Design a protein around this ligand. Structure first.
Ligand SMILES: CCCCCCCCCCCCCCCCCC(=O)OC[C@H](COP(=O)([O-])OCC(O)COP(=O)([O-])OC[C@@H](COC(=O)CCCCCCCCCCCCCCCCC)OC(=O)CCCCCCCCCCCCCCCCC)OC(=O)CCCCCCCCCCCCCCCCC
Ligand SMILES: CCCCCCCCCCCCCCCCCC(=O)OC[C@H](COP(=O)([O-])OCC(O)COP(=O)([O-])OC[C@@H](COC(=O)CCCCCCCCCCCCCCCCC)OC(=O)CCCCCCCCCCCCCCCCC)OC(=O)CCCCCCCCCCCCCCCCC
Ligand SMILES: CCCCCCCCCCCCCCCCCC(=O)OC[C@H](COP(=O)(O)OCCN)OC(=O)CCCCCCCCCCCCCCCCC
Ligand SMILES: CCCCCCCCCCCCCCCCCC(=O)OC[C@H](COP(=O)(O)OCCN)OC(=O)CCCCCCCCCCCCCCCCC
Ligand SMILES: CCCCCCCCCCCCCCCCCC(=O)OC[C@H](COP(=O)(O)OCCN)OC(=O)CCCCCCCCCCCCCCCCC
Ligand SMILES: CCCCCCCCCCCCCCCCCC(=O)OC[C@H](COP(=O)(O)OCCN)OC(=O)CCCCCCCCCCCCCCCCC
Ligand SMILES: CCCCCCCCCCCCCCCCCC(=O)OC[C@H](COP(=O)(O)OCCN)OC(=O)CCCCCCCCCCCCCCCCC
Ligand SMILES: CCCCCCCCCCCCCCCCCC(=O)OC[C@H](COP(=O)(O)OCCN)OC(=O)CCCCCCCCCCCCCCCCC
Lengths: 47, 97, 139, 55, 119, 344, 27, 100, 38, 52, 61, 458
């Protein structure tokens, strides 16, 4: 332990959920953008 | 008009030479600085007036409103200086060397 | 300004008088400017002292202008080869030497000679190869 | 299998680089495959049941 | 450039950039941005004096996944900008054809470059 | 500061550059410059130490006269063209005065003397705002007047700043003074390519901002305004010693790090435009800048300077976590040369 | 009469030729 | 005086670990840091490497050219052609500047 | 036997308000650490 | 300009009054309203390099 | 795999590098032309909006 | 060539992730194998050089080096396990990584198609080297040495940067392949006469020429053994590799723009060789030996005759291996003696029997004993130099006599004579010290059997 306890000893569970959850929103938008993109590219051009 | 504009412009340069050649008290400078704003205000107003460009008259005044505060800041610095040295001479402002 | 330019118009090694005069002026002009910055900042103690410094710098610079002009022109004269960086180098070589003397230092003459001469030589090459300085944007 | 404590976790780092390396160097070929067989000195005609000269 | 016809005054990537192929998510560059990111994360842990690799495993992810996210959408654009540059460049070469005529060099047989011997 | 005042000022210091950039009516560009002048002066004297009042009174006079000169250019234009904005036709002297006045605001080269003195005697945090955020508003005016400004004037302004900035750095040991002398040189590279490739002007700025902002938050992490002070970094916080090393060598142009790109593409653009005279001399004395950067490297990292006994006490109490962005821009600086094609 | 408007480069974008042609970036 | 440590002596690592191989102080690391260095150093680089380098075939074509010469010298001599004609690029192909 | 770490004297030079102090340039003594003058 | 937050937002706080031919109060045309118009409808679509 | 692979790979590398080189030079010529000509989409410097002209009676000729 | 490189990068993760006790063996064992993968590039069964991919290529000139660059990392990490074994477990993993990055960077520089890729990687190698010399340098003067090593290279470097960007505008690509198959013939103007100097000067500086070589004696003196090995074996040769690939362009000027350097080098060869004759610091003498034997190389990369270039490639690889061997054994004496002085430590063979055999073979490699690639190299440069002007044998003839004298003096006053009475008793030789040597010479014996591989492009 510590005479002056750490401010970080037990996790700031908000900081996990907006850090984890934010990243999983990034991917699901990113991967979506790509496949969506690929299509737009294919149809906009010949295929 | 061209002759008058020449005089006003040189007035601004004579005021320019003034603010770029200090001598003792700062309040002189700030005062000179203001001499330019008057010359700019007069020239802006003059051409706007003989171009009948009324859409631009707002500017001659915006120039003064901004210049007044600008000077307000300048004088508060000046008062701050003759509170820390009490003599307001550009001469003692050299600690930063 | 049509003046200074004249230096270049006449073939090098010819009409040294004009060359030396022009070169002397440029140096002197630089002298004035240099003294001015030297007096504006790092001011003097008395007006006279500063007038002197202006003079010193002006003359020294005028001298390094003259010898450069004279040496380069004559070197070309005597050597008979008008287009040769070496002429100028000898000139720059000399110019540096004058600076060295005015500053009463053999060492300065050393760096002065090499650095100054090299620079002048490059000017000759620059003119010979049509190098462009401060060029307009042509992208 | 990836025994830990630097048991196979680490020992397999460099080796793996090699494989990845070879995976790229054989992929670079795939890109630079124009003139596949269109070069003059080596322009043979495809032998029966052979897809391409050099892969 | 700007002033170019149709310029979108404040847009990131005009829809015209749809026509271009999307950046492969594993494009070496986006993968670099990923590593660039992981390192930012690791560096942070270090400057803040935390176990370097065993800490902030959530942050590690935010970093590797923020940088990468940024990449795809940036590269997507920079890719467009470069593509506009050709559209623009190639077009001009034609619209003003005379200025960029197609030279026709001579087979070496004809040209006679001088030979400096080493001896 | 009554938090309300803090907001009003900070808003102005931020509305100041933004109005400049957004507007086209030059007048509105001038007042954007004016608001920046008014907002920065209060923060500069926050300690209100005797050095500070000197700083602000200089900064203000230098800023004010330049502001008046910029206004005169706009006033003159108004009579040479009814427009309130510079045009192809603009008299050359009109643009030259504008060029001199804004360089005065940026402290680019001949007026470089005010920037080191003003930077000394103001807190490091405000110093960062002064060197980076304040600088963007003047250059935005210049990027707009890119085609009009004359090539010879800024080329010499640029060469002068490289020379003065480098020389100033070797003699100065005051860390904040050193930060100012690099910004004068970096500003010289930015204007050198201004009449040529503005995109590169901007790039040479962002990279300077992404380099200087981490460097200063490093200087303050331990609030060291002395090299001797930054040299004991090894005891106060050892990790930042590695990146402080690379960021400073990045600030100078050494090739593996991100800092080479701005110099490299500026040189490529100047040679494309044929200034192989000017570009060469700039690159050469640019090398002088690295000498003073590496001299600091020596003191802070490559060699361990002796420390006082009380330093053990500061190690004991928990250290202030450096900012989240210090880490991201530290890797963004020093490690993005492989991403150079997309940056330009 | 006003001056003719300058021509309009026309067509559709195609991935840049050989990509970024920065020194040594096969990209 | 400014506080600083007294000169550290260099240990005779050969006093303990009398089998010291020069790599590390504790004995097992040393043994396993030479059993892997002589091996990967000598046993499979100087040996397997030299084996492979020795078997690189006709390096830079100099094994091919000593035959191609032999059939060219065989062919040129029997057909009576000069063994190394004196112009290589045929004169007919060349279009010499006509005037000069 | 010890890579030479810098002693006090090597450190001394870096003090002073200017690294290369010339005539009438050594007069300058370092600015107060607190950034406040007497 | 450098950051066109005005065109984007569609607002026109700074463009309505940049030239002498802009809307003058009470429709009091200024001197030259005729020319500047003829100058700037000419140089519209033609860039500066060719507005010069 | 063979002599064939490097020979054909090296020719492909040269074609990409030759074509990149010709284009880089043509850029510099096109960019010289549009700057001075001002007849191309690049280097089209702005002049004030025609949009804000007041085309009205204005109680004056 | 990404197996010689990617697996290399991965070394860095291994030096960091691995256990403090096992960090040394994982790194040294793995890079020995990294060298084995490097040997695959030697399989050239045809003249067509190997263009692995757009940016990465390996031709006869680079291949003999890439293998040496990969080979020394193992050795460098074996020669610095002693000093650097007194560190904190995070200073080591930094030194090991620094050494690893040098060959990653050097492997790429020697295996780079675009000349500016050479420049960026070329001048990057200074960062790792300056850290190795300054951070771990024993003497008070390494701060100074580091400055000299950074400025002499840097002031030369920016002219090359301007020159290469210049040719890219003049020709349109810095790709060594194309630049070779394209017509770039300088026109003997005054300006070109400057271009040529701009391109060659940066390479001539790190290849110590007589005029600018003061950086190398100062740098190797205080540099740690691993840094001194890298500077002599791979770092200096970066300058030679550059001169071979850059003079493909600037073809006409070097015919007459070389005289200045050629004479600077051959007279330089004599004076640098001679001052070796009375220099008290052994590391000092090896460094000037390195300047003289590298002055021969700049005098063969400028005469430009097939044999010169072939002699140069032979000597550079050979002298690289020999110099390190000499710098490595100098360190073994330095660590037990604790002083660089040559006069102390006399008679070692009496107490270190084998190290003396390694000393003898290293010296015979240093001087030109004939069944050695070292001699073949000099014999060839000597021949061409003679062709350039029959008089050259006089100056390249005073160097051979002097080279014999200092090479044997190092053996005679360090490894013979009566033993020093009682210096700190000299502990016996470690097996690492001896292998680090054996690893240098066994390859020197094997390469001498088949010189064709290091024969150059010509
Ligand atoms: C390649 C390698 C080549 C190797 C060659 C051989 C080397 C041998 C070893 C080196 C050696 O021996 O050096 C010893 C030498 C020993 O000097 P020192 O004892 O330290 O004192 C001399 C210091 O300069 C003293 O400076 P200070 O800081 O102490 O200032 C005090 C000084 C102050 O000076 C004075 O009050 C007296 C007046 C001096 C200047 C007068 C002229 C001013 C105008 C500029 C010069 C004229 C230009 C004209 C151009 C005409 C064009 C047409 O008072 C003096 O009495 C000394 C005069 C010093 C003159 C040089 C410095 C001022 C001139 C340059 C100004 C511009 C740059 C700075 C801005 O080393 C130096 O310090 C050299 C100083 C700088 C020399 C510059 C020479 C010109 C360079 C031209 C470069 C290209 C330009 C284009
Ligand atoms: C390190 C340089 C990385 C450069 C880069 O990633 O993009 C280059 C960019 C893209 O690479 P590329 O050669 O086009 O790749 C094409 C290949 O065929 C590969 O194309 P592909 O079609 O095979 O793509 C499939 C993909 C499939 O592979 C994957 O990505 C799977 C996931 C792999 C994760 C690996 C984690 C470790 O391959 C990759 O993306 C992995 C490639 C290597 C990634 C970086 C590894 C380090 O172009 C260049 O290579 C030129 C720049 C090279 C470096 C110049 C600067 C050197 C000096 C600075 C060094 C950097 C540090 C800063 C200085 C030191 C500061 C402390
Ligand atoms: C030949 C022409 C040479 C022109 C030299 C101009 C700068 C002269 C200079 O810097 O020296 C004056 C002063 C130092 O004074 P002092 O110690 O007495 O030594 C005098 C050495 N000449 O130096 C100083 O006080 C500090 C530097 C002041 C001037 C610095 C350069 C300012 C810009 C000069 C070039 C013009 C730029 C124009 C931009 C538009
Ligand atoms: C090149 C960097 C490769 C990094 C691979 C992974 C390294 C890792 O996982 O972390 C451990 C590594 C060694 O640890 P160390 O730096 O000695 O400090 C440990 C304090 N807990 O610590 C490190 O990560 C060192 C590398 C940090 C990033 C450096 C970027 C330059
Ligand atoms: C192009 C390559 C250029 C050269 C790259 C390699 C050199 C980079 C420049 C290094 C500059 C600084 C050199 C001196 C640094 C001294 C650092 C030091 O003394 O260590 C203490 C520091 C903090 O310690 P801590 O991690 O908290 O744990 C121990 C607590 N005492 O712990 C540390 O600082 C050491 C660990 C730092 C983080 C790891 C960095 C390791 C080096 C990674 C090199 C990657 C090279 C990649 C090359 C690619 C080439 C294409
Ligand atoms: C002939 C062909 C070319 C051959 C090479 C010529 C050029 C060589 C330049 C580098 C020469 C070696 C370095 C010389 C400078 C030097 O050694 O600096 C030391 C000196 C005193 O340094 P100090 O303040 O004590 O602290 C230094 C950090 N410990 O620091 C000083 O006194 C000032 C040093 C300034 C920096 C000089 C090196 C960089 C020069 C950049 C400009 C080049 C020209 C433009
Ligand atoms: C001090 C160290 C540098 C001294 C001079 C080094 C060599 C010259 C500059 C660098 C190399 C170079 O590229 O110079 C060639 C340049 C002209 O380039 P060129 O390709 O000949 O163009 C002719 C177009 N008709 O011609 C030049 O760049 C002349 C440059 C003059 C200034 C040299 C640097 C002075 C630094 C202080
Ligand atoms: C590669 C570039 C440089 C790299 C340097 C560092 C590399 C280290 C890692 C790799 C080490 C192994 C690779 C390098 C050695 C290659 C050995 C080799 O190539 O042997 C070839 C030889 C076959 O002979 P070959 O030349 O093919 O036949 C000629 C036909 N006209 O096959 C053999 O005969 C093998 C014979 C083994 C034992 C030979 C001993 C002979 C000694 C003769 C000289 C003795 C006196 C030497 C005096 C030296 C004085 C210093």
């Amino acid at each position: 332990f510590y005479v002056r306890e750490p401010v970080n000893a037990k996790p700031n569970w908000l900081a996990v959920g907006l850090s984890v959850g934010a990243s999983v929103f990034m991917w699901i938008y990113l991967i979506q953008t790509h496949n969506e993109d690929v299509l737009e590219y294919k149809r906009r051009n010949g295929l | 008009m061209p002759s008058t504009f020449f005089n006003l412009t040189m007035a601004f340069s004579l005021s320019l030479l003034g603010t770029l050649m200090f001598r003792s008290h700062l309040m002189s400078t700030l005062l000179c600085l203001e001499g330019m704003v008057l010359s700019l205000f007069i020239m802006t107003s003059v051409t706007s007036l003989n171009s009948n460009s009324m859409s631009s008259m707002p500017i001659p005044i915006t120039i003064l409103v901004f210049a007044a505060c600008e000077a307000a800041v300048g004088l508060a610095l000046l008062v701050k200086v003759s509170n820390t040295y009490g003599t307001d001479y550009v001469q003692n402002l050299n600690l930063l060397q | 300004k049509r003046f200074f330019e004249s230096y270049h118009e006449v073939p090098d090694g010819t009409q040294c008088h004009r060359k030396t005069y022009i070169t002397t002026a440029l140096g002197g002009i630089c002298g004035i400017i240099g003294s001015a910055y030297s007096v504006s900042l790092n001011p003097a103690d008395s007006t006279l002292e500063a007038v002197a410094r202006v003079g010193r710098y002006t003359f020294t610079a005028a001298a390094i202008g003259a010898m450069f002009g004279l040496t380069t022109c004559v070197s070309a004269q005597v050597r008979e080869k008008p287009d040769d960086p070496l002429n100028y180098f000898i000139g720059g070589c000399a110019g540096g030497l004058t600076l060295g003397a005015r500053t009463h230092s053999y060492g300065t003459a050393a760096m002065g000679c090499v650095y100054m001469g090299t620079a002048a030589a490059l000017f000759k090459i620059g003119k010979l190869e049509g190098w462009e300085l401060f060029p307009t944007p042509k992208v | 299998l990836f025994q830990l404590l630097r048991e196979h976790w680490v020992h397999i780092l460099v080796p793996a680089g090699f494989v990845f390396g070879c995976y790229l160097d054989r992929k670079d070929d795939e890109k630079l495959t124009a003139f596949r067989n269109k070069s003059m000195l080596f322009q043979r005609e495809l032998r029966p049941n052979e897809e391409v000269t050099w892969k | 450039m700007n002033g170019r016809p149709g310029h979108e005054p404040l847009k990131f990537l005009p829809d015209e950039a749809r026509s271009l192929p999307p950046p492969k998510l594993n494009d070496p560059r986006l993968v670099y941005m990923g590593l660039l990111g992981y390192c930012t994360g690791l560096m942070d842990n270090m400057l803040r004096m935390r176990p370097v690799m065993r800490a902030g495993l959530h942050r590690q992810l935010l970093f590797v996944t923020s940088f990468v996210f940024a990449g795809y959408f940036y590269l997507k654009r920079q890719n467009y900008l470069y593509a506009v540059k050709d559209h623009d460049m190639f077009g001009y070469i034609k619209l003003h054809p005379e200025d960029f005529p197609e030279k026709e060099k001579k087979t070496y047989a004809e040209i006679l470059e001088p030979f400096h011997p080493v001896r | 500061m009554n938090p309300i005042t803090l907001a009003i000022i900070y808003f102005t210091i931020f509305l100041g550059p933004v109005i400049t950039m957004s507007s086209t009516n030059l007048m509105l560009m001038w007042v954007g410059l004016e608001f920046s002048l008014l907002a920065i002066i209060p923060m500069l004297i926050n300690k209100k130490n005797p050095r500070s009042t000197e700083a602000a009174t200089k900064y203000f006079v230098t800023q004010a006269t330049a502001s008046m000169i910029i206004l005169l250019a706009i006033v003159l234009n108004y009579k040479q063209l009814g427009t309130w904005m510079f045009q192809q036709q603009t008299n050359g002297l009109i643009l030259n005065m504008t060029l001199m006045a804004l360089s005065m605001k940026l402290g680019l080269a001949p007026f470089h003397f005010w920037l080191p003195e003003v930077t000394q005697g103001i807190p490091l945090h405000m110093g960062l705002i002064l060197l980076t955020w304040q600088k963007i508003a003047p250059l935005s005016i210049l990027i707009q007047i890119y085609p009009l400004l004359n090539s010879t004037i800024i080329l010499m302004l640029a060469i002068t700043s490289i020379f003065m900035g480098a020389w100033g750095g070797l003699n100065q040991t005051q860390m904040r003074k050193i930060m100012a002398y690099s910004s004068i040189a970096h500003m010289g590279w930015m204007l050198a390519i201004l009449p040529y490739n503005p995109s590169l002007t901007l790039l040479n700025l962002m990279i300077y901002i992404i380099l200087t902002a981490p460097m200063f938050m490093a200087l303050m992490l331990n609030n060291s305004m002395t090299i001797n002070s930054i040299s004991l970094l090894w005891n106060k916080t050892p990790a930042m010693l590695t990146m402080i090393s690379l960021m400073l060598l990045s600030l100078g142009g050494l090739p593996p790090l991100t800092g080479f790109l701005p110099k490299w593409i500026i040189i490529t653009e100047l040679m494309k435009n044929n200034c192989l005279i000017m570009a060469t001399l700039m690159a050469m004395m640019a090398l002088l800048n690295l000498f003073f950067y590496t001299r600091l490297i020596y003191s802070t990292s490559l060699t361990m300077f002796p420390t006082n006994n009380n330093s053990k006490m500061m190690t004991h109490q928990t250290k202030t976590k450096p900012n989240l962005m210090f880490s991201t821009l530290a890797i963004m600086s020093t490690m993005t040369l492989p991403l150079a094609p997309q940056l330009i | 009469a006003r001056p003719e408007p300058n021509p309009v480069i026309e067509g559709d974008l195609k991935p840049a030729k050989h990509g970024t042609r920065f020194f040594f970036w096969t990209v | 005086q400014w506080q600083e440590d007294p000169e550290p002596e260099d240990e005779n690592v050969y006093a303990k670990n009398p089998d010291f191989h020069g790599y590390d102080s504790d004995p097992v690391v040393d043994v396993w840091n030479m059993r892997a260095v002589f091996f990967f150093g000598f046993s499979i680089v100087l040996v397997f490497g030299t084996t492979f380098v020795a078997y690189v075939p006709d390096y830079r074509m100099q094994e091919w050219a000593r035959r191609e010469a032999e059939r060219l010298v065989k062919y040129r001599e029997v057909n009576g052609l000069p063994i190394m004609e004196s112009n290589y690029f045929d004169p007919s192909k060349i279009q010499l500047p006509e005037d000069d | 036997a010890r890579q030479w770490q810098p002693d006090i004297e090597w450190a001394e030079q870096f003090s002073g308000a200017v690294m290369y102090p010339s005539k009438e340039t050594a007069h300058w003594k370092p600015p107060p650490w607190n950034d406040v003058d007497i | 300009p450098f950051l066109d937050i005005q065109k984007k937002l569609g607002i026109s706080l700074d463009r309505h009054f940049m030239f002498l031919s802009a809307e003058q109060p009470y429709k009091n045309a200024a001197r030259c309203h005729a020319f500047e118009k003829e100058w700037i409808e000419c140089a519209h679509g033609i860039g500066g390099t060719r507005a010069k | 795999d063979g002599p064939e692979k490097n020979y054909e790979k090296t020719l492909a590398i040269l074609q990409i590098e030759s074509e990149k080189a010709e284009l880089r030079l043509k850029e510099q010529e096109v960019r010289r032309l549009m700057r001075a000509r001002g007849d191309g989409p690049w280097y089209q410097f702005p002049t004030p909006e025609k949009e804000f002209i007041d085309h009205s009676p204005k109680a004056t000729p | 060539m990404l197996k010689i490189i990617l697996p290399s990068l991965m070394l860095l993760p291994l030096t960091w992730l691995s256990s403090p006790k096992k960090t040394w063996t994982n790194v040294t064992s793995y890079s020995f194998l990294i060298s084995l993968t490097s040997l695959t590039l030697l399989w050239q069964t045809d003249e067509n050089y190997k263009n692995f991919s757009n940016m990465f290529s390996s031709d006869p000139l680079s291949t003999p080096l890439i293998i040496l660059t990969a080979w020394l990392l193992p050795l460098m990490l074996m020669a610095s396990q002693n000093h650097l074994k007194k560190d904190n477990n995070v200073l080591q993993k930094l030194y090991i990584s620094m050494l690893i990055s040098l060959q990653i960077l050097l492997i790429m520089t020697f295996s780079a198609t675009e000349l500016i890729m050479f420049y960026i990687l070329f001048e990057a190698t200074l960062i790792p080297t300056l850290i190795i010399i300054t951070r771990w340098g024993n003497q008070t003067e390494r701060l100074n040495a580091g400055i000299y090593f950074l400025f002499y290279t840097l002031i030369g470097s920016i002219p090359l940067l301007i020159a290469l960007i210049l040719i890219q505008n003049h020709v349109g690509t810095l790709n060594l392949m194309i630049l070779s198959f394209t017509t770039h013939t300088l026109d003997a103007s005054w300006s070109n006469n400057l271009l040529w100097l701009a391109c060659m000067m940066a390479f001539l500086i790190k290849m110590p020429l007589y005029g600018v070589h003061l950086w190398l004696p100062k740098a190797h003196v205080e540099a740690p053994i691993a840094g001194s090995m890298i500077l002599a074996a791979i770092l200096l040769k970066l300058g030679s590799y550059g001169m071979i690939r850059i003079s493909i362009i600037l073809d006409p000027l070097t015919k007459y723009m070389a005289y200045p350097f050629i004479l600077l080098s051959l007279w330089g060869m004599i004076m640098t060789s001679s001052i070796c004759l009375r220099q008290t610091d052994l590391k000092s003498l090896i460094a000037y030996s390195s300047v003289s034997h590298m002055a021969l190389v700049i005098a063969s990369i400028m005469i430009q005759t097939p044999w010169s270039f072939m002699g140069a490639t032979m000597l550079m690889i050979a002298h690289g291996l020999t110099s390190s061997l000499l710098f490595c054994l100098a360190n073994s004496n330095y660590e037990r003696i604790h002083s660089r002085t040559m006069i102390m430590a006399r008679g070692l063979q009496m107490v270190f029997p084998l190290m003396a055999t390694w000393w003898l073979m290293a010296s015979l490699a240093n001087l030109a004993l004939p069944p050695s690639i070292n001699l073949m190299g000099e014999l060839f440069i000597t021949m061409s130099l003679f062709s350039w002007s029959n008089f050259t044998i006089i100056l390249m003839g005073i160097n051979i006599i002097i080279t014999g004298m200092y090479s044997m003096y190092m053996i005679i006053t360090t490894q013979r004579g009566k033993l020093t009475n009682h210096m700190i008793n000299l502990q016996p030789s470690h097996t690492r010290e001896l292998t680090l040597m054996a690893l240098h010479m066994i390859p020197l014996i094997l390469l001498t059997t088949s010189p064709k591989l290091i024969t150059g492009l010509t």
